[PDB]
Design a binder for this molecule. Structure first.
Ligand SMILES: *[C@@H]1O[C@H](CO)[C@@H](O[C@@H]2O[C@H](CO)[C@@H](O[C@@H]3O[C@H](CO)[C@@H](O)[C@H](O)[C@@H]3O)[C@H](O)[C@H]2NC(C)=O)[C@H](O)[C@H]1NC(C)=O
Lengths: 55, 175
């Protein structure tokens, strides 16, 4: 890959959610960039916006 | 002027009647004076502030939606995410650009109503007692004055009792 920040190689980010009462399974023989834990999943009423206006 | 009245046959503008939205002008012996009304002035404005409350300050609170501006050429989904949002704005606009057209035109035949429903009232509580001089203004046969005025200007008028000057100055005098 083109030279980026020195490095010419890179990583591919992926996601997986596990519903209560299910188990997660990771099985790699190389190149695994494993996770250190899970993020909490809320339902609420939030979003995100691209804006330069100041708060 | 769907009802006609305003800007119809009452083709004159009441300059600075500030004590309301309506009233009369008496030409009795006591000179003149443009008096202010209520059950018509509050009446119309009652409604205008009614259709309005409807319009103004109400619905719509939406949180997470689809994106609408785009940084790189994606195709298909892209196209679509646009065309969907575009179609929305587009519709919502025409709904708007007409909610006005309508509410607006009818806002009118609603004012030009209270008019053509007051002259049309005076011209009821009093029989041959007088007639709208030609058009616009009225014509009286009695020597009504400031006190006498609180008759029609209060619906307190007897076309029976206070009738004396009837046939007379009418079709009775020489001709
Ligand atoms: C495949 O080809 C590309 C380009 O032909 C190779 O990338 C180039 O790799 C060199 C180092 O191997 C990078 O050089 C450094 O560039 C910086 C930036 O100006 C400079 O400060 C350093 O002194 C040095 O010249 C170069 O930036 C990089 N170019 C790009 C755009 O990728 C790549 O390594 C080749 N891969 C293999 C295995 O041959």
């Amino acid at each position: 890959r083109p030279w980026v920040r020195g490095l010419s190689s890179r990583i591919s980010i992926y996601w997986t959610i596990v519903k209560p009462g299910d188990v997660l399974v990771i099985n790699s023989n190389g190149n695994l960039i494993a996770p250190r834990g899970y993020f909490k999943m809320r339902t609420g009423k939030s979003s995100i916006m691209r804006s330069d206006a100041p708060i | 002027g769907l009802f006609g009245a305003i800007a119809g046959f009452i083709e004159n503008g009441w300059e600075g009647m500030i004590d309301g939205w309506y009233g009369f002008r008496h030409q009795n012996s006591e000179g003149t004076g443009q008096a202010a009304d209520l059950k018509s002035t509050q009446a119309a404005i009652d409604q205008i502030n009614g259709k309005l409350n409807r319009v103004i300050e109400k619905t719509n609170e939406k949180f997470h939606q689809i994106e609408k501006e785009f940084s790189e050429v994606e195709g298909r989904i892209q196209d679509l995410e646009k065309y969907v949002e575009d179609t929305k704005i587009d519709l919502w606009s025409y709904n708007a650009e007409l909610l006005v057209a309508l509410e607006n035109q009818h806002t009118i035949d609603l004012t030009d109503s209270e008019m053509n429903k007051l002259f049309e009232k005076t011209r009821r509580q009093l029989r041959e007692n007088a007639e709208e001089m030609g058009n616009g203004c009225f014509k009286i046969y009695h020597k009504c004055d400031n006190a006498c005025i609180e008759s029609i200007r209060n619906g307190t008028y007897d076309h029976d009792v206070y009738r004396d000057e009837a046939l007379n100055n009418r079709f009775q005098i020489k001709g």
